Scaffold this active site. Structure first.
Site, PDB file in Angstrom:
ATOM      1  CB  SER B 197      -0.943  -0.110   1.238  1.00 23.13           C
ATOM      2  OG  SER B 197      -1.506   1.124   1.411  1.00 23.13           O
ATOM      3  CD  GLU B 324      -5.174  -4.665  -3.963  1.00 25.81           C
ATOM      4  OE1 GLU B 324      -5.264  -4.029  -2.842  1.00 25.81           O
ATOM      5  OE2 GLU B 324      -4.011  -4.935  -4.436  1.00 25.81           O
ATOM      6  CG  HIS B 437      -5.452  -2.609   0.352  1.00 25.05           C
ATOM      7  ND1 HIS B 437      -4.779  -2.436  -0.936  1.00 25.05           N
ATOM      8  CD2 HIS B 437      -5.228  -1.812   1.278  1.00 25.05           C
ATOM      9  CE1 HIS B 437      -3.825  -1.667  -0.372  1.00 25.05           C
ATOM     10  NE2 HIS B 437      -4.198  -1.142   0.712  1.00 25.05           N
TER      11      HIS B 437
HETATM   12  C1  LIG Z   1     -14.032  11.574   6.247  1.00 23.74           C
HETATM   13  O1  LIG Z   1     -12.801  10.779   5.805  1.00 23.74           O
HETATM   14  C2  LIG Z   1     -12.550   9.665   6.635  1.00 23.74           C
HETATM   15  C3  LIG Z   1     -12.014   8.469   6.037  1.00 23.74           C
HETATM   16  C4  LIG Z   1     -11.439   7.510   6.330  1.00 23.74           C
HETATM   17  C5  LIG Z   1     -10.959   6.049   6.156  1.00 23.74           C
HETATM   18  C6  LIG Z   1     -10.622   5.159   7.150  1.00 23.74           C
HETATM   19  N1  LIG Z   1      -9.888   3.939   6.797  1.00 23.74           N
HETATM   20  C7  LIG Z   1      -9.543   3.703   5.477  1.00 23.74           C
HETATM   21  O2  LIG Z   1      -9.823   4.159   4.572  1.00 23.74           O
HETATM   22  C8  LIG Z   1      -8.766   2.183   5.182  1.00 23.74           C
HETATM   23  C9  LIG Z   1      -9.947   1.306   4.478  1.00 23.74           C
HETATM   24  C10 LIG Z   1      -9.402   0.046   4.241  1.00 23.74           C
HETATM   25  C11 LIG Z   1      -8.853  -0.461   5.317  1.00 23.74           C
HETATM   26  C12 LIG Z   1      -7.841   0.202   5.781  1.00 23.74           C
HETATM   27  N2  LIG Z   1      -7.237  -0.503   7.133  1.00 23.74           N
HETATM   28  C13 LIG Z   1      -6.478  -1.783   6.841  1.00 23.74           C
HETATM   29  C14 LIG Z   1      -5.203  -1.744   6.369  1.00 23.74           C
HETATM   30  C15 LIG Z   1      -4.284  -0.890   6.561  1.00 23.74           C
HETATM   31  C16 LIG Z   1      -3.079  -0.934   5.830  1.00 23.74           C
HETATM   32  C17 LIG Z   1      -3.063  -1.936   4.765  1.00 23.74           C
HETATM   33  C18 LIG Z   1      -4.021  -2.364   4.431  1.00 23.74           C
HETATM   34  C19 LIG Z   1      -5.074  -2.565   5.233  1.00 23.74           C
HETATM   35  C20 LIG Z   1      -8.566   1.451   6.320  1.00 23.74           C
HETATM   36  C21 LIG Z   1     -10.866   5.456   8.421  1.00 23.74           C
HETATM   37  O3  LIG Z   1     -10.675   4.342   9.297  1.00 23.74           O
HETATM   38  O4  LIG Z   1     -11.314   6.393   8.880  1.00 23.74           O
HETATM   39  C22 LIG Z   1     -11.785   7.346   7.987  1.00 23.74           C
HETATM   40  C23 LIG Z   1     -12.405   8.367   8.838  1.00 23.74           C
HETATM   41  C24 LIG Z   1     -12.874   9.496   8.013  1.00 23.74           C
HETATM   42  O5  LIG Z   1     -13.150  10.484   8.734  1.00 23.74           O
HETATM   43  C25 LIG Z   1     -13.390  10.385  10.058  1.00 23.74           C
END
Ligand SMILES: COc1cc2cc(NC(=O)[C@@H]3CCC[C@H](NCc4ccccc4)C3)c(=O)oc2cc1OC
Ligand SMILES: COc1cc2cc(NC(=O)[C@@H]3CCC[C@H](NCc4ccccc4)C3)c(=O)oc2cc1OC
Ligand SMILES: CC(=O)N[C@@H]1[C@@H](O)[C@H](O)[C@@H](CO)O[C@H]1O
Ligand SMILES: CC(=O)N[C@@H]1[C@@H](O)[C@H](O)[C@@H](CO)O[C@H]1O
Ligand SMILES: *[C@@H]1O[C@H](CO)[C@@H](O)[C@H](O)[C@H]1NC(C)=O
Ligand SMILES: *[C@@H]1O[C@H](CO)[C@@H](O)[C@H](O)[C@H]1NC(C)=O
Lengths: 532, 532
Positions: B197, B324, B437
């Site tokens: 990633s 992914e 992913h």
């Molecule tokens: C408003 O915008 C926001 C956006 C986001 C996005 C978040 N997480 C993620 O995008 C990703 C999705 C895929 C799973 C990954 N973790 C596993 C992982 C980790 C490392 C390598 C591989 C896999 C988390 C998030 O936790 O919180 C958010 C909070 C927000 O506002 C409070």
């Protein structure tokens, strides 16, 4: 006598013709308009002054002045579409096949030939009414209309060359059928007009134009559609092409009266010689002088008419062939030849995409290409060749007809949709061409029934199957026999969108015919081009 | 002693750790930078002042300050990615697993964690070097770097917050490995840096940036790519986001010195609380503070660097997972939930397409939709769900990596490309999510070998198969054993474009991985958006 008929325009004397070891009657070359010559060239058609005596309506009439195909001299596959009678500006005639004995009120079918509005003849061997009139007890009528510049030169706002006159030709022949077909034993309230290609676009144009709707009952469109990209031009474009025709013949271009007078002095073949020089682009499947959206024949734009239910509400039967584009690539795209498998280089595919969508900017050209290229095997000259066949079929025929059939069904009293995908076993064109534009006509007119034309028995079975669907549809508004044993050709509905196959294999029903690509042509590419 | 090593920065004392009924050595939490606190927050990293005495390098170090995922409290599938040690701005440490006995010059592998540049920890159970170091005789190193605003706030032209400092963190850890890994029995001329990633985008960034190329030999990128649409911003955009972070914390925004001083007064968790509020769009797979194209770390735009061979020429091993996008739809797209099959209405598909391509105008939104919709069955919530999974995978990972691998191969000394499509049998996430992913990481680090984690024997077979490909690649530049009995993982060439499968089934070789869709993302949609 059987062969003598007292019409409102005068008596006419037909002839007895044989058809499959029996006989019926024929009235060939009956006038329905005044000969549109001299000062009448380019003018709206006038009705035939009625005549004293009897019209010798036993031989076919002249064909209207047109461009003649000579890409393959002597080749029957190309010659069967050329004029088989001498050409005259005096082409306004029609032909009636009447069963015998003369029925009293059977169904009437009027045929409207195609050929891009620049060519066609009511007199071709493939348009012979006799096999259909005899097999199905219908009264078969075929009209003719002015093609080319003679029928569609468009200096709008002038009354000497207003445009659309070839459609008015068609209309007057339809008015003559309405007024007089009863004296031939035809029911004038059961006339089904059918056509192919340009003739199918004509059939659907009479559905839209108000001046035409009350002259026919129902409609069959084959590989044609009023909204086809080649079937009509705007007033500005029709004027520009008319002015450019003038420039090729060294005409005074100052006034419209000056252009029209100059063009009437010219002999016919002089306008035919330069007719193709006025197209705005390097193109395939574009013709010079076509119907113009004028505000009169067509009250407004065709798309607003289709959106606003502004058209004759009735039943329609319509459909397409499998490989509609291949005929037109043979004539103008690089790589294709009658005598090779016409495998198509990556580079010549690129060139075909240009000639098929000539109005598209580079970004639109890329969109087409992306959509029709197998990128896991890009340099495959069969996939590039077949892909082009689909680019030209979808854009020019199948996808504008689907649009028409989706818009019409929203407001109509019935719709039946076919996919003709039988390669005729005796076809003289190469096999790479597939199921060719205009090659269902021979089955609709029952030439397979002449078991002297080399047809498999299954194909006779198919022609009879098809001829019955057509006639039974013209008679009732449903191709299906009530209380019948074969599978039922389902109606086409906005919900389920069913349609059927037309081939020697047992009938099959599919849905959403080529919707994937037709979404692209009808909704995505127009949005893309409008966006800059 | 084995666990005592005299480095150029001072002595360090590691610990003996067990691993699969044997033992090896570990040196955890070794500093490589000065703690970037107080006035150093946001500043380029400085090298650790060398120390007198011995460093107690037996326990894991603090994790760097980050946002913590609490969408699924208690759920291991989400918790295994969160910090497992207390968070400190003092996160700059690294960890070495050394085989035993201490070899003299074996291959060195440096791990670079991911998490969108906004999160990550060198200390996760899934990053444990011991199974890999022991099984393959390599020296496993894992660095840490400042994430979030702490590592990527970008007021360009200022020297207090120039941007990219989290990469400079990575670089300094790589400089420390180059200088000192020989005292741990590592060959400093055989360091393979690998990441996933964001960490894979980092690995490929060090390939591009000149200040970094001479510090490592070869490279492995997993589901990451320097040119990913989320991996970097422009200088203007990085400034705007930095200023907007200031506005959320009620900062004086007049001068850059005034913004930076205001931001250093704040406690860490105050910047994390508002970090997500500065994104320009409603989006998925976009992170607030990421590397900036600055002219220094990156001399010019990434696309010109890739076109002009301007990068470290070596061998690279890289690849993607099957599904992914599904992880990111779960977090922000409407319709998806951990506990349903997440069938997706036509309307919620529409909403997902918006959140996946947030920079696209309406015409681009239509293009995406057309390309990914089965129009013969449009209202199928499995096809809409799977389609979204591919929209997010292709755009954000697979298609930018293919672009990288097509550009890099044109100038490099070797390329190996994989498609990891094995759903792990013990996976706690729903089955609709597919091959997720970051879920090949557990096979690269050999967690299947712990036959106390519930893994099928075939999966141990797969992990050993994969761990050997990686290590043998890091050692030689070819994952294949010379004179070996298994099928050979072919090199990736511009001509044939082969790649292999990574799963429990016998190895198979395909070509032109997802080229159809990647033509659309890499060449068509950018042209369309640039056109107005
Ligand atoms: C408003 O915008 C926001 C956006 C986001 C996005 C978040 N997480 C993620 O995008 C990703 C999705 C895929 C799973 C990954 N973790 C596993 C992982 C980790 C490392 C390598 C591989 C896999 C988390 C998030 O936790 O919180 C958010 C909070 C927000 O506002 C409070
Ligand atoms: C520069 O522009 C030119 C364009 C053309 C196009 C010609 N023909 C055709 O487009 C079509 C192609 C498909 C076959 C059809 N005939 C059979 C047919 C007829 C009716 C219904 C169904 C089927 C002919 C042409 O003959 O000559 C041209 C000459 C040109 O310049 C001198
Ligand atoms: C296919 C279709 O719409 N059929 C309609 C039929 O329902 C209706 O009763 C009739 C009214 O005359 O018009 C037509
Ligand atoms: C895959 C590839 O391109 N291999 C090349 C190899 O041909 C060349 O001899 C070597 C020179 O050191 O660099 C690398
Ligand atoms: C009709 O015209 C044709 C062609 O000249 C001629 O051969 C035929 O005998 C004519 N018949 C009558 C009844 O006038
Ligand atoms: C290192 O620190 C840990 C954590 O406080 C402690 O338990 C351990 O005994 C220490 N070891 C040495 C040798 O200082």
């Amino acid at each position: 006598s059987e062969l003598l008929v007292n019409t409102k325009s005068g008596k006419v004397m037909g002839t007895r013709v044989p058809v499959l070891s029996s006989h019926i009657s024929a009235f060939l070359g009956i006038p329905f308009a005044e000969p549109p010559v001299g000062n009448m060239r380019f003018r709206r058609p006038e009705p035939k002054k009625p005549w004293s005596g009897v019209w010798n309506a036993s031989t076919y009439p002249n064909n209207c002045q047109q461009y003649v195909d000579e890409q393959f001299p002597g080749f029957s596959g190309s010659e069967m579409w050329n004029p088989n009678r001498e050409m005259s500006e005096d082409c306004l005639y029609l032909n009636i096949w009447v069963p015998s004995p003369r029925p009293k009120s059977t169904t009437v079918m009027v045929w409207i030939y195609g050929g891009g509005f620049y060519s066609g003849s009511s007199t071709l061997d493939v348009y012979n009414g006799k096999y259909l009139a005899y097999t199905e007890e219908v009264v078969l009528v075929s009209l003719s209309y002015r093609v080319g510049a003679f029928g569609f030169l468009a200096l709008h706002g002038s009354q000497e060359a207003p445009g659309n006159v070839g459609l008015l030709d068609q209309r007057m022949a339809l008015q003559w059928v309405h007024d007089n077909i009863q004296f031939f034993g035809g029911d004038p309230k059961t006339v089904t007009i059918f056509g192919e290609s340009a003739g199918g676009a004509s059939v659907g144009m009479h559905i839209l134009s108000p001046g035409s709707r009350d002259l026919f009952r129902r409609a069959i469109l084959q590989s044609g559609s009023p909204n086809c990209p080649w079937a009509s031009v705007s007033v500005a474009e029709g004027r520009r092409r008319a002015v450019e025709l003038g420039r090729n013949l060294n005409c005074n271009l100052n006034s419209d009266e000056e252009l029209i007078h100059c063009l009437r002095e010219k002999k016919p073949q002089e306008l035919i010689d330069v007719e193709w020089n006025v197209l705005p682009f390097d193109s395939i499947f574009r013709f010079s002088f076509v119907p113009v959206i004028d505000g009169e024949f067509f009250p407004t734009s065709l798309e607003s008419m289709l959106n606003s239910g502004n058209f004759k509400k009735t039943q329609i039967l319509l459909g397409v062939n499998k490989d509609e584009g291949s005929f037109f690539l043979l004539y103008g795209a690089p790589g294709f030849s009658k005598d090779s498998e016409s495998k198509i280089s990556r580079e010549d595919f690129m060139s075909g995409v240009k000639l098929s969508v000539p109005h598209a900017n580079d970004l639109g050209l890329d969109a087409v290409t992306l959509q029709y290229t197998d990128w896991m095997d890009d340099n495959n000259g069969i996939k590039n060749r077949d892909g082009l066949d689909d680019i030209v079929g979808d854009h020019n025929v199948i996808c504008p007809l689907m649009h028409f059939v989706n818009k019409y069904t929203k407001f109509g009293n019935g719709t039946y949709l076919y996919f003709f995908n039988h390669r005729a076993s005796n076809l003289v064109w190469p096999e790479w061409m597939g199921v060719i534009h205009g090659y269902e006509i021979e089955f609709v007119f029952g030439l397979p029934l002449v078991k002297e034309l080399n047809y498999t028995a299954e194909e006779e079975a198919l022609s009879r199957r098809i001829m019955h669907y057509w006639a039974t549809f013209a008679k009732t508004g449903n191709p299906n026999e009530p209380h019948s044993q074969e599978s039922k050709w389902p109606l086409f509905t906005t919900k389920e969108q069913k349609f059927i196959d037309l081939n020697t294999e047992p009938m099959k029903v599919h849905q959403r015919l080529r919707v994937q690509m037709c979404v692209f042509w009808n909704q995505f590419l127009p949005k893309l081009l409008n966006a800059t």
